[PDB]
Every structure is written in structure tokens, then in C-alpha cells.
Ligand binder design. Structure first.
Ligand code: HEM
Ligand code: HEM
Ligand SMILES: CN(C)CCc1cc(F)c(F)c(CCc2cc(C(F)F)cc(N)n2)c1
Ligand SMILES: CN(C)CCc1cc(F)c(F)c(CCc2cc(C(F)F)cc(N)n2)c1
Ligand SMILES: C[C@H](O)[C@H](O)[C@H]1CNc2nc(N)[nH]c(=O)c2N1
Ligand SMILES: C[C@H](O)[C@H](O)[C@H]1CNc2nc(N)[nH]c(=O)c2N1
Ligand SMILES: [Zn+2]
Lengths: 419, 415
């Protein structure tokens, strides 16, 4: 039928019909809900490698119909010709190439349909760099450097995606092996502990195993590990003057700066797959700007990440013998004031979780008003601190899967046969 | 499939859920859309004879299985005996053992409840002989006094007669057994608890003489056998209360704040074997954030962030200062400090969530699963620094269960 979502703080009720265009399984059934599973479904739309014609063309016709609907053509001359063009193409190459207009429409709409992203109010303001002519790891490096430089924009951050050649036969994939374009190494210490970012211990070891000489610090920017057309990946060092970094200080605790903490300014997801009309872009690094809690709650305070809660609490002179003192909670707040005060002072774009979630509510309103819906994953939209004092906490959401979309994909080292 | 798997992304522990195969009723999701954040996805609708027969059977089978007597002579004769009642009376009566098992497992099956590590230690008060609202008051006073235990709180449930035709329901009209009155002022302000303004109006209309203060314990509005509800004042010496002070801020006690010790849900329906127990108030003890985050700091509730932040001398001209977050923590420190100091049972969100992970893992071990509602299990503050945040969960409905039911003033036929 049609489904209402209610906000329990304001009583606003929105009526969703967009969900009737969803195509892929969520993982839930009438009997089981998988809303907190990280990767619930394996329901693809095309399979394994090079698809047959009855597999690829129907997904292609769907996207071409959607795009031409979007611009109030549809059935027009260009639409019908574009159909016959894609059809001849799949007959002669088993794939097809998107026009520049289609590529831009698909990237933006992948962002617009990403249920887990609180930042989608900006979706239509996305700079797309077409890198489909790229042939080598060096060329991917050059494209990524220009990406990182354009996106950073001396701190006034700008949204971008750079789109390398689509998958052909599955053995010629372009990949960025780094999960984000800029991350810190994680070093396995002999005395069992971990230096740097512990999430990157494996990837940091692949880098070392590939020739990288680690400086062995707490904030070593990792090299890029770039794979072009299925070949072995290659290491490249991002010029540090393109890597904007913010030293973390606290507006009250003068001792905070003495913690020797910094973070980088540009979040840049580079291990996801962008799916458009059955085409799969296995290398599509995209970037935007941070929500402060991403750095200061998750990066800094997860137990398997930087885990700095105890040391900050120690400096704060907090009773850390029992949880009911809420010392973790108190430090957590202060760290996130620090991150926000630092980025803002160095005029690096950042948004707090209050303003960020307020904007998403406004985006939800806009999307129901003009599109009849907005897929939204509550579990990922609600921020990891102060959930209930943000408006999304009180907002019912519907989650469904629209195409074009960003998908997860296996880490290429589980997959790649070397040579 | 015969097995679904859940992973903890912080610990890498992976558990295998077989128990979801035994779930029977809807979650609200479809195969193409998830409704995991929807809060709620007829009175004459009492089960028919043929409807009730498999529900009873499934429940009795489950019960004899649990006591390792499945297929036994006593099992078969119980089944036979339940069947005869449904045939003859169009309903049946639970034995005392079954009632206790049913109510414990409704708590066990409550996917939204983080405190379920305690489910088997539940004191069950059988009140199926009650016939009038005065009798209900007597039962509920005894529940309160037993559960409160001078601050050393004990979880309990009082079960009133089950539904018959939908026209003789027993109902506690209160949502909780102890709540504070809310009063809307002519100028648009609200005195007391803004969440309780509607029910406060019902009581006053029923005759309640309101003190018009900020912490007026509301009266009980008790409905027996489908008659109009009646008012009773819980004796004030049974309502344990805690003044809220701060361990560091001298001024906090000057906010005049206090809360009650006993959380006691009274508007939910307990469903066992197809039978509906429309009045079944249960109580435990608080997790700190229920008071500290939601009761005090929701904009729709007491909304004292601004007053606390002011007395904290915080910069409130821009959100990015995180003055709200900073004030919310201290309020929650105060709530925990004050209960602990007065030796009233309370649990903080870190201990509670950690215990629930242990609980979940045990339930996977001994039961084959544990349905759980991540949207609700995760505390309303500091979510990611508590271990449940990183814990994948599967949500599904098992019976016996606790269910929502429509508010009684929306359906009652006044006499
Ligand atoms: C511009 C400001 C943006 C903000 C503040 C923002 C914020 C967020 C946050 C907080 C998450 C939660 C995931 C996590 O916490 O790890 C997320 C997820 C996501 N975002 Fe955005 N984002 C922004 C831009 C973008 C852009 C430009 C794209 C794509 C072009 C994008 C696509 C996604 C996707 C695909 C996910 C889900 C990724 C996953 O499942 O791991 N976002 N975003
Ligand atoms: C023993 C201490 C207990 C603690 C600390 C506890 C904690 C909680 C919390 C925090 C919630 C979420 C409530 C909300 O945010 O509105 C909840 C929900 C719930 N609890 Fe427990 N609880 C306890 C005992 C019990 C008992 C004894 C029962 C019944 C016998 C019970 C049944 C439920 C149910 C049915 C829900 C879901 C409420 C709903 O769906 O609206 N709980 N619990
Ligand atoms: C699996 N978990 C641990 C990942 C944690 C994580 C570590 C990182 F370094 C990192 F950059 C991210 C980006 C999320 C993100 C992406 C984007 C988009 F513009 F690209 C914008 C934004 N604001 N946030 C996430
Ligand atoms: C449906 N929701 C939105 C209502 C909000 C709400 C407001 C309140 F005042 C209140 F007390 C509760 C108690 C839940 C609860 C129940 C129990 C159990 F032992 F009874 C223990 C516990 N710790 N908590 C919930
Ligand atoms: C919209 C959303 O489902 C709703 O606000 C939920 C979110 N999670 C919750 N979790 C708990 N414990 N209590 C609640 O009232 C809610 N409310
Ligand atoms: C278990 C749960 O699915 C997992 O911890 C999720 C929960 N919500 C999240 N929300 C965001 N924004 N980011 C995350 O990584 C996660 N992780
Ligand atoms: Zn679901």
C-alpha cells in the first residue's frame, strides 16, 4: 500500500510512496527484521562476471527510462535512439558506456538514495570527475590528487566523486585498495599493543609488504595503493601539502593540545562500488566533509580504534573506577567540543551532529514533498552520541533500496590473483 | 535458513540464531522495506474457538517442552483438558505454573528491553480472582509495596482476569503505576510532566482534586470487568521518591528536582497461549538514562537542559559548543548519584548494556537466539561507547509476548 512515517517530537506525519520503486531485498521479512545487520542482503541485480544480454539490457533500459523520465523526455526521439544505442552496444561488446549526462545523474542519485547518509541535503551539489579514460595506476594517482586538491579547496571543503572505468569481465577491475583516500597507519607492536589507527593494521601491513617504509608514528598518512585494469596494485605517496590536517585543541583545557592529537580534514570513501543501470564502477572515490562525531566519538573513542577516553579522563581528574560516574560520557563530550573548536578555528568545513541531523529532517521533508519518500536507515542516521536530544531520534524512517546506488564490495586482497 | 548469523563488530564474536525459526507473528517489515524504526508498525476482536485452539496448543507444547515433559501423559491430558474448555466455554484457564511461565517468557521475549538478564527472577502475583476496582487497588498497593522493598527493588507483575468478550476488560488506565501530573497553563506553559497532560485531564474530570504542583503523584484509574474506571490515591508512604542532587554542583539540588524509584508499566497487554491479559502491570528498577536523558531532557518532557546549562554558565549561542550534550551528562550523573546515595536500585547505561550482551550470548548458547530491537536497546546517550551499539541483532516476535493496546479512553463505552 502506502506507508506513513511519524515524528514523535513534532507529530508531523509523512506519506511514503517512493518505496514502491524499490528493487532489491533489504534482508527483512514479515517475520525477521535485519535493520541492525551491517550487510544483510547479497541480492545483486546482475551476477558474477560479464552478464548475458537478457541480464544487462533490462537493467540498462530501466536506468535510461528513469534518466529520460527525470528530464521530462521519455519516449522522445533521444530516448528511443538511446535505447537502440545501448542495445547495439551490448550486442557488440556485452556492456555499454554512459553519456556524460547519464554519469552525472547516476552519481548524484546514488548519493541521494544512500539510506545511511545523514548528509544528503547536499546531494545535487556534487562535482563529478569523469576518469573513465584512465588506464594505469599512475593515471589513477593523478586523478585522485586532483580530486583531493579540488575537494579540500584550502579548507572550504567541496563534494566530489571521481569515477574510473567500469568493470568489464571482473578480472580487469580498477580499485582503490585504501578504504578511504586519507587514513593513518596502524602498527602492530611486539609487546601486543597497537600504535596508530588499529583499524588499519592489516592494510598498513599490506603497504609495508609492498615496499612502504613506515615512519612508525601515531598519525602516519598511508600511501595510496592503486589497481588499474586488474594489474597488481602500486604504491603512491600523496603530497602532504594536499593533505589538510587540523591539530586538536580545546577552547578551555589548555592541556588538551599537549595530547598531540590531529585529524585530517577530508573524509573520502574509496572502497565502495557505484552501480548504475547494471554497470559497476569498482573505483569511485567520493568525499565531502565530516560530522564532528565521526572523528571525536568513533575514530577517537571506539575500543578498537584510538581509545583515548581513559587518557583524556585522567587529564580531567575523573573518578574512573565505576561506570556510574559517567567519566567516559564526560570525556566524550569534551573531545567533541575539541574537534569542533579546532576545525572551525582553522576554517575547515565541519558540521556538528545537532545541525547535521536538523538538516536531514529538513531534507526528509523536501524529499517526501517532491519525490514521495526518502529511504533512511535510522540505525546509521542517529549520531553515536546524544542520540535522543537530536531530532532524528524521534523520527520514524522507512528503509528501502533504490537504484542507482553505492554498494559494498569485497576487499580486493581477498580476491586479487597476483603476478 | 536453518541458521542466521550475527556479528559484534567490536569483539568479532559471531553468534548463530536458530530460534527465529520458531517466530510466528509479524515484525512489520516486508522483503523490500524495513520498518525497524516505526514505533507501532477492535475490542470485539476476541479470538474465536478455532483461532484459539492452535494458540493454546503451541503454548502448552512449549510449556511441557520447557519442563522436559513433552509427549508425556500429563502433557496429553492437559491438551485434552484445554481443548474441552475451549469447546465448552470458548476460552480456557491457565494453571498457576503456566501463568508464571507465560509471564516470565513474555519478558524474556521483549525485544526492546535491555534488562532481560533478570527475566527468570520475576515475582508473579496472580490476581485472576479480582472482580472490582477496589480489589484492583488492593492488589496494586501490594505490588508496589513488595516491588519497592524500601529501595531494594524487586521486579514483579500482577495479572488481572483475562479478556472475555472484549466488553468486560480489566484495565489500568494509567500508563505507569507511578507518574507525575502535567498541567497546561492558560499562557501555554506546562507545570509538572508535559507527557501526562491528557491523562491528568481525565483524572480531574473524573473528580480528582489536583494539588497543581510539579511532582503530584497521579491517582490510579482502575477499570474492572468493563465498568467505568474508578479513582484511588496510592498511599503516599508507598511511593518511594529520590531528591536529585549533584555530587559536585552545590546548586543542583536547588532545581527542586525529584523522581520516583519504581518504574511500573501498566498499559500493555500480556498474551499467553492466545489469552489476552489486558491489565498486567509490571515493575523493575530504572536505568539512569530513562530519567536522566528522556524524562528530564526531551523537549516534550521536563526539558531542563536550558536551566542546567544556564547554571553551568555554558555558551548557548551556538550548538557546536555542545552545551546540550554537556548538560545532559551532568543531569545523568546527578540521577545516578542520588539513587545510589539513597540506596535505591538503579543501573547505569554502561552496566546495563554490558549485562545485556552477556545475556544475549547466554541466550544464544542455551536457547538458540535472543530477539532484540537495536533501535531500542541502544541507550539514548553515548550510544557508540556502549557495547550494544556494535552488536548486530535480529528482531522477531515470540509468544508469550507483551503487546501494545489502544488507550482505554479511546474505546470505553461509558455507563
Ligand atoms: C557532504 C557531507 C557529508 C556528510 C556530513 C556525510 C555524513 C555521513 C555519515 C555520518 C555517514 C555514516 C557512516 C559512518 O558513520 O561511518 C554517512 C554514510 C554514507 N555516505 Fe555520507 N556524508 C557526506 C557526503 C557524502 C557524499 C558526497 C557521498 C557520495 C557521493 C556520501 C555517501 C555515503 C554513503 C554511500 C554512505 C554509507 C556508507 C556505508 O554504508 O559505509 N556521503 N555519511
Ligand atoms: C529489571 C529492570 C529493568 C530494566 C533496567 C529495564 C530496562 C528497560 C528499558 C530501558 C526499556 C526501554 C524503555 C523505554 O525507553 O521506554 C525497556 C523496555 C521494556 N521492558 Fe524492560 N526493564 C526492566 C524490567 C522489565 C520487566 C520486569 C518487564 C516485564 C516483566 C519488562 C518489560 C519491558 C517491555 C515489554 C519493554 C518494551 C516497552 C515498549 O515496547 O514500549 N522490563 N526496559
Ligand atoms: C567502517 N567504519 C569504521 C568507517 C569509519 C570511517 C573512517 C574514515 F576514515 C572515513 F573517512 C569514513 C567516511 C564516512 C564519511 C564519508 C563521507 C563521504 F563524503 F565520503 C562523508 C562523511 N562525512 N563521512 C568513515
Ligand atoms: C513506550 N515508551 C515511549 C514510554 C516511555 C516511558 C515513560 C516512563 F515514565 C516509564 F517509566 C517507562 C518505563 C519503561 C520501563 C519498564 C520497566 C518495567 F519494569 F516495567 C523497567 C524500566 N526500567 N523501564 C517508559
Ligand atoms: C522513531 C523511533 O522509532 C522512536 O523515537 C524510538 C527510538 N528508540 C527508542 N528507544 C527507547 N529505548 N525508547 C524510545 O522511546 C525510543 N523511541
Ligand atoms: C551493530 C551495528 O549494525 C553497527 O555497530 C552499526 C550501527 N550503526 C552505525 N552507525 C554509523 N553511523 N556508523 C556505523 O559504523 C554504525 N555501525
Ligand atoms: Zn526490518
Amino acid at each position: 500500500r502506502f506507508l506513513k512515517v511519524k515524528n514523535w517530537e513534532t507529530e508531523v506525519v509523512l506519506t511514503d510512496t517512493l518505496h514502491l520503486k524499490s528493487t532489491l531485498e533489504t534482508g527483512c521479512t514479515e517475520y525477521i527484521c535485519m535493520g541492525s545487520i551491517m550487510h544483510p542482503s547479497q541480492h545483486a541485480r546482475r551476477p558474477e562476471d560479464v552478464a548475458t544480454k537478457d541480464q544487462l539490457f533490462p537493467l540498462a533500459k530501466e536506468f535510461i527510462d528513469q534518466y529520460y523520465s527525470s528530464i521530462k523526455r521519455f519516449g522522445s526521439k533521444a530516448h528511443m535512439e538511446r535505447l537502440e544505442e545501448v542495445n547495439k552496444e551490448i550486442d557488440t561488446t556485452s556492456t555499454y558506456q554512459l553519456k556524460d549526462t547519464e554519469l552525472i545523474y547516476g552519481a548524484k542519485h546514488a548519493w541521494r538514495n544512500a539510506s545511511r547518509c545523514v548528509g544528503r541535503i547536499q546531494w545535487s551539489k556534487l562535482q563529478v570527475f569523469d576518469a573513465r579514460d584512465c588506464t594505469t595506476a599512475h593515471g589513477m594517482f593523478n586523478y585522485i590528487c586532483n580530486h583531493v586538491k579540488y575537494a579540500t579547496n584550502k579548507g572550504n571543503l567541496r563534494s566530489a566523486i571521481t569515477i574510473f572505468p567500469q568493470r568489464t569481465d571482473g578480472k580487469h577491475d580498477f580499485r582503490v585498495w585504501n578504504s578511504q583516500l586519507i587514513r593513518y597507519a596502524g602498527y602492530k607492536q611486539p609487546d601486543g599493543s597497537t600504535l596508530g589507527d588499529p583499524a588499519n593494521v592489516q592494510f598498513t601491513e599490506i603497504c609495508i609488504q609492498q615496499g612502504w617504509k613506515p615512519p612508525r608514528g601515531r598519525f602516519d598518512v598511508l600511501p595510496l595503493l592503486l589497481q588499474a585494469n586488474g594489474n597488481d596494485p602500486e604504491l603512491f605517496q600523496i603530497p602532504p601539502e594536499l593533505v589538510l590536517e587540523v591539530p586538536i585543541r580545546h577552547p578551555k583545557f589548555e592541556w588538551f593540545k599537549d595530547l598531540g592529537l590531529k585529524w585530517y580534514g577530508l573524509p573520502a570513501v574509496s572502497n565502495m562500488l557505484l552501480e548504475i543501470g547494471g554497470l559497476e564502477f569498482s573505483a569511485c572515490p567520493f568525499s565531502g566533509w565530516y560530522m564532528g562525531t565521526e572523528i571525536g566519538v568513533r575514530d577517537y573513542c571506539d575500543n578498537s580504534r584510538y581509545n583515548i577516553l581513559e587518557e583524556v579522563a585522567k587529564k580531567m581528574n575523573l573518578d574512573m573506577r565505576k561506570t556510574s560516574s559517567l567519566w567516559k560520557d564526560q570525556a566524550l563530550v569534551e573531545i567533541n567540543i575539541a574537534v569542533l573548536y579546532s576545525f572551525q578555528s582553522d576554517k575547515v568545513t565541519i558540521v556538528d551532529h545537532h545541525s547535521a541531523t536538523e538538516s536531514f529532517i529538513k531534507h526528509m521533508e523536501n524529499e517526501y514533498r517532491c519525490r514521495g519518500g526518502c529511504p533512511a536507515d535510522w540505525v546509521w542516521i542517529v549520531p553515536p552520541m546524544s542520540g535522543s536530544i537530536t531530532p532524528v531520534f524521534h523520527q520514524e524512517m522507512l528503509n528501502y533500496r533504490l537504484t542507482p546506488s553505492f554498494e559494498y564490495q569485497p576487499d580486493p586482497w581477498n580476491t586479487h590473483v597476483w603476478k
